From a paper:
Within this cluster, we showed that a GH31_u1 protein from Lactococcus lactis (LlGH31_u1) and its fungal homolog demonstrated hydrolytic activities against nigerose [α-D-Glcp-(1→3)-D-Glc]. The kcat/Km values of LlGH31_u1 against kojibiose and maltose were 13% and 2.1% of that against nigerose, indicating that LlGH31_u1 has a higher specificity to the α-1,3 linkage of nigerose than other characterized GH31 enzymes, including eukaryotic enzymes. Furthermore, the three-dimensional structures of LlGH31_u1 determined using X-ray crystallography and cryogenic electron microscopy revealed that LlGH31_u1 forms a hexamer and has a C-terminal domain comprising four α-helices, suggesting that it contributes to hexamerization. Finally, crystal structures in complex with nigerooligosaccharides and kojibiose along with mutational analysis revealed the active site residues involved in substrate recognition in this enzyme. This study reports the first structure of a bacterial GH31 α-1,3-glucosidase and provides new insight into the substrate specificity of GH31 enzymes and the physiological functions of bacterial and fungal GH31_u1 members.
We determined the cryo-EM structure of LlGH31_u1 at 2.73 Å resolution using single-particle analysis. The cryo-EM structure revealed the hexameric state of LlGH31_u1, and the overall cryo-EM structure was similar to the crystal structure (5 A and B). The Cα root-mean-square deviation between the cryo-EM and crystal structures is 1.340 Å. In both the cryo-EM and crystal structures, most amino acid residues at the hexamer interface were identical. The cryo-EM maps for the side chains of the amino acid residues in the C-terminal α-helix domain were well resolved, and most of their conformations were almost identical to those in the crystal structure. At the C-terminal α-helix domain, Val716 and Phe732 hydrophobically interact, and Gln728 forms a hydrogen bond with Lys720. By contrast, the local resolutions of insert 1 and insert 2 on A-domain and a loop containing Tyr99 on N-domain (discussed below) are lower than those of the other regions, and the cryo-EM map of these side chains is unclear. Furthermore, slight structural differences between the crystal and cryo-EM structures were observed. Although the insertion regions are determined with low B factors in the crystal structure (the average B-factor values of insert 1 and insert 2 were 30.2 Å2 and 33.5 Å2, respectively, and those of the other structural components was 33.7 Å2), the structural difference may suggest insert 1 and insert 2 flexibility without the crystal packing effect. However, the cryo-EM structure suggested the flexibility of this residue, and this tyrosine residue is not strictly conserved among LlGH31_u1 homologs, including CmGH31_u1.
Numbering used by the authors:
A (entry chain B): 12 to 739
B (entry chain D): 437 to 739
C (entry chain A): 133 to 588
The structure:
């Protein structure tokens, strides 16, 4: 059907834009699954074959393949791609590097301060990319079966500028991302500190008192014995025995943590192995091998079936019986492969397979291991320095990660190690993190690196508390996006050119992205201007009307604009007609919220579908009529916000309402915003009064712009121009 | 020297002076071709302006009205009339803001800050329009000078400056469309009245004369060498001048010492974007600020 | 093949050639080398290199004038108007270059791809191509057209049916864009039915614009085969004809001309170009043709254009080039009066210098003497001849040191460091005398250029 043999090579047409090419010298072609590819059962498409004595030609509706026989070389195997847009070079050569690729992720995090060299993905501005299947053969149960018979295997993606379809077909080829649990979408706390049980409980109670919600408690390697290891054994980083000096009753500690409704994870360091001093060591000794005369059994070889069974039943077993939910695998090693397979990949695969018995749709913490790692969330990065350059780089890295299917990155919120202190840097970093896939605050072993909100002054502390509350307010939206991603394969964080691929400005703004399908985020990653007391960012607005998510400031159609925000504010925008669901009680810990606020931005029709574990709520906004319907019976109450004014509060059941007679406008007006902006600027008073009086007196917009064009300070010019453009 | 002479042409007395040095000659042919041609053109314009100057002279001797007046003589109750020192009124019809600073090498254009009172103003030479009360930075090449006339102004000019005549044999009347216009040309033994009411232009003479009259409405010639006092209707003619945004923008971008891709991008985007606000927003993002100001002046003229 | 130490090694890495001019596959010899041990006798080394690899053929006289080239959508009447404007302004021209817009570009069928390849006249812009070429020849201009063979002879071409009868008829419904320049029959069809009617219309020579990354099919670079066979074919149209192509390694000097292009419009490119042109003689490539005015990118500067053109007038080939932009015109009347007059004067001087250039051409073809030579060809034993990169000898009578730096605004004059060997030298234009061996910083206005001739 869609299989073609020619010379020593085979060609498969998986779809009209994806083509598999196999070359094997011996003569047998691979058929079983690999580390990367998990399924090849696609549909059937139309294609043509032209056969000569020594050459073959493949016709597809978008790609034209030429093979001249023999070994693969840019002279023998090559292709042409036909797309509506034009390009300087539209011909793909084997082995020849092509330009225009939009990049992907990196295996190891290696940036010194700012940008790092990224690896290629499956998206290109030219329209084609090549993914090499360099992995190792996988069995039908999930075991390595050695090297593949095929010498080389390639997958040509020729989707042009339809990136969403390319991502969907990539997920079809390699397997969809599994669902994440709800608790993973809250705030994570992690500090590398020598915590005691009572001190940890006191810290949690302090967090509760300060009105900061948390979902996951992360306990680092100090949970086990470190300095009590005998002299014979080496690094005490590996440990599976509770430190009874710090944790007299681990069971009661975990019970208290669950009583506060927190999910508990522990750091694991399997690199050394199961030594003889471990409390569960005797049991493992009965399973793997008893010591001959006087020895130990730290045989960390994750290839053996029996070792994996003992490690998943007798080492992790009692700890998970105490109440540990999931495991943080911190394997900081340089790929010490024993059987030609990276041990981190095997750890991730088998640990994620094992974690499913503890909870439904469980997760792990581990590191990226190349294509195909998206099936085992989550993957964290860490190892970033605490500087403005890292904050500048991170949004671009997170948004570009979607080009290779890795959509659940978990960065270190606060930075990791080295760096310099700046409270504003921390606040900006956290503002970015709240609108990131995973919000995990991390601190190291230093009294100067605490990320607690009360460690700063009043303004910074209040801003951090507000944003931490907003993260838990946004949980239903994140969970619905999670379900959509697991079902259809839609990334939560997307680059601008996923929605606007035909426009050049969508490629000129790296740190701007789409958060879900309703909000557009452009974080501020530069230090505040001391004169204006405001940071700035360059934002591109596509066609239509956009409103600031927090203040309601209006923005017009396609335009590039420099916007200014104070350190306590963030640029987040929603277009007219957007519908946002929010939790009304973020502080309360409920598996499903008891009441939901619907925020509606007037201007056009709107549509949202809130997906839950066992429910589906439909929200329509058509012709000024807002309708909420439910698939199943529920006791949830609904509150409606139209612009900024409350419409109905704690309304019960599915309903409909008319909003034609209400006030479409928000609370934003030009005069108050102008006064606030002039009030915090460090300029002369006479200048402030002159600007305020003249901008109040002049009526025409053109003459207002002409008046502000004469000012000698240019950042003030830009701020006033943004204000005038909003109020046109 | 060129800027100094441009100021001098629109001054009370134009007297070129040189000292005992072969390096201080003020002759036009002592410079390169461009400077020499500009000097010759302005020296001819000075003699073209003689009837206007003589009428202002007679008015000054009769009633006591200064030929060159500060801005606050006509607009005494407005603060901006006290904040522009080098801007003045030349006679009763023209406003002059000479450029007295060195050219910007990047733009190849000098600049000056000009305050425009209420009404519509046109550049005396190019016809570029300017709106009501506004402060604007305007840019001119070394061969151009900022001189403005408000809508309805009537200017008499000598048609043959090279010919030396005690009284000109023919006079050109330049009319700026937009409002009613008034002028009274005083001579040694004559008085010519020029009216522009409701689109009707009338020239009358107190005494008999053989002078011919040519009419310029905007930039287009209306009637050439008309004889005797007459009346004419200008309602159906073209009020607009020859100035348009596209040619001026191309000329300004053509002489700037910037990268070519920037020039093509600016030209294409300003041709493509329709709304004025979004054009100003597009030019606000440019990193070079003097180019920003020049483009803003062009956009404000073409609003 | 030149060295201050005295020896160099040239590696024969090419492919075996037959007695008729066809590739015969890889050589039996594993490695082949040529050791040149001429010391500091560079002229003799160049003569022996030309003896070994073949002398450079003569160039026609019209190639030594001014070339005009603009990537614009010209119409026949507009092109004739531009030529008449050039005549009115007293600017002589020798060659008219018509870029790729001479053929169909935007009216290619949607099926076919890049319409860069074309062999059909655009009748909307050129209703009567024969009459247009006749008018151009009536103004005594040699005409060349841009050619893009990369795609091939598609079915929509006007001469496509004829080629279809020669190479292969379409089976049921196909085309014949089989651009494989190795087959004898394909080359015959391309040189008889494709270029044939156009050369009958009056096209003199062909501009081969092959912008590809050496996609070799039989182990031979296609550009070399194109140059060889195109130059062999151009000889029937005119006696000692030429082509426009690109450099293809040692041995390309037998097929003039080769252009460079792709230079940015900046002062650094002007600083580099004289050294590149003079150093090209060390490998036998003595007929470079640079893009006069720059090619792409860069910033505007009228002084940069004037200096660049002043260098170009005293270069092997003077070819003014402009791109698809209304801001990149190289016409003299696009500038102010002083720059325009200087450009007109230098363009007239280029045609004044034609007999000297033709005599140097004949000398180069006969004995093998480069027109543009480095200083150390005539003064090999003096250190200063190795310390002045942009100074060279133009023919055998003149020494040129172009100014490649921006003018000093205080003095209103640019400057250049010039080394004068023993004897008396005079400025070619003003007659200012200069004494014997000395290093001197000389200053010239933007309308003047440093060119020197020794006494006698």
């Amino acid at each position: 059907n869609n299989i073609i043999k020619f010379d020593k090579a085979r060609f498969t047409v998986l779809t009209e834009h994806l083509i598999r090419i196999e070359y094997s010298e011996t003569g047998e072609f691979e058929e079983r699954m690999t580390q990367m590819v998990q399924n090849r059962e696609f549909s059937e498409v139309n294609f043509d074959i032209i056969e000569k004595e020594e050459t073959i030609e493949i016709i597809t509706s978008t790609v034209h393949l030429y093979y001249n026989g023999g070994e693969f070389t840019n002279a023998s195997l090559f292709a042409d791609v036909k797309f509506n847009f034009s390009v300087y070079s539209n011909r793909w050569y084997f082995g020849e590097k092509s330009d225009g690729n939009l990049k992907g992720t990196t295996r190891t995090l290696d940036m010194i301060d700012g940008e790092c060299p990224l690896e290629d993905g499956i998206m290109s501005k030219n329209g084609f990319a090549v993914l090499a299947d360099k992995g190792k053969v996988l069995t039908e149960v999930g075991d390595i079966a050695g090297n593949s018979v095929s010498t080389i295997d390639l997958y040509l993606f020729a989707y042009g500028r339809d990136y969403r379809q390319a991502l969907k077909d990539f997920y079809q080829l390699t397997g969809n991302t599994p669902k994440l649990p709800r608790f993973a979408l809250g705030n994570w706390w992690s500090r590398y500190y020598d915590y005691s049980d009572k001190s940890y409980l006191a810290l949690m109670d302090k967090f509760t008192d300060k009105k900061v919600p948390l979902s996951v408690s992360v306990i680092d390697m100090d949970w086990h014995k470190v300095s009590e290891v005998p002299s014979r054994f080496g690094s005490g980083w590996t440990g599976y025995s509770w430190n009874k000096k710090l944790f007299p009753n681990p069971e009661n500690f975990i019970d208290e943590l669950h009583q506060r409704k927190l999910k508990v994870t522990l750091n694991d360091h399997p690199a050394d192995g199961i030594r003889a001093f471990e409390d569960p060591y005797p049991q493992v000794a009965q399973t793997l091998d008893l010591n001959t005369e006087l020895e130990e059994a730290a045989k960390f070889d994750f290839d053996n079936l029996k070792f994996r069974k003992a490690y998943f039943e007798e080492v992790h077993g009692p700890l998970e019986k105490e109440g540990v939910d999931f495991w943080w695998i911190d394997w900081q090693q340089g790929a010490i492969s024993k059987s030609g397979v990276d041990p981190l990949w095997l750890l991730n695969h088998y640990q994620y397979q094992n974690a499913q018995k503890k909870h439904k749709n469980n997760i792990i913490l581990s590191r990226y291991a190349g294509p195909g790692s998206h099936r085992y969330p989550l993957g964290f990065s860490g190892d970033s320095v605490i500087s403005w350059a890292s904050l500048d780089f991170q949004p671009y890295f997170t948004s570009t990660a979607s080009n290779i299917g890795y959509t659940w990155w978990s960065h270190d919120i606060g930075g990791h190690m080295q760096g310099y202190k700046d409270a504003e840097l921390s606040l900006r970093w956290l503002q970015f993190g709240v609108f990131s896939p995973i919000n995990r605050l991390h601190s190291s072993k230093s009294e100067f690196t605490s990320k607690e909100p009360w460690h700063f002054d009043a303004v910074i502390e209040q801003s951090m508390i507000d944003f931490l509350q907003l993260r838990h307010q946004l949980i239903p939206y994140l969970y619905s996006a999670n379900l959509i991603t697991a079902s259809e394969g839609r990334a939560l964080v997307e680059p601008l050119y996923y929605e606007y691929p035909m426009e050049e400005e969508a490629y000129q703004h790296r740190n701007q992205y789409l958060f879900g399908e309703q909000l557009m985020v452009a974080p501020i990653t530069e230090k505040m201007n001391s004169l204006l007391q405001m940071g700035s960012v360059e934002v591109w607005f596509p066609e239509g009307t956009w409103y600031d998510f927090f203040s309601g400031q209006p923005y017009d159609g396609k335009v590039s604009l420099k916007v200014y925000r104070e350190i306590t504010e963030m640029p987040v925008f929603a277009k007219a007609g957007a519908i946002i669901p929010l939790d009304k009680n973020p502080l309360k810990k409920e598996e499903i919220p008891s009441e939901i606020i619907w925020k509606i931005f007037p201007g056009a029709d709107g549509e949202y579908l809130l997906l839950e574990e066992d429910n589906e709520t439909k929200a329509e906004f058509v012709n000024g009529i807002f309708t909420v319907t439910s698939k199943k019976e529920s006791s949830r109450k609904h509150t409606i916000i139209y612009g900024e004014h409350e419409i109905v509060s704690a309304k019960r059941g599915e309903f409909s309402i008319d909003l034609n007679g209400k006030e479409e406008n928000f609370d934003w007006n030009f005069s108050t915003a102008l006064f606030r902006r002039l009030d915090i600027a460090e300029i002369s008073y006479e200048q402030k009064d002159e600007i305020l009086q003249q901008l109040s007196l002049i009526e025409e917009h053109e003459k207002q712009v002409a008046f502000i064009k004469t000012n000698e300070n240019q950042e003030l010019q830009n701020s006033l121009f943004e204000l005038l453009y909003s109020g046109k």
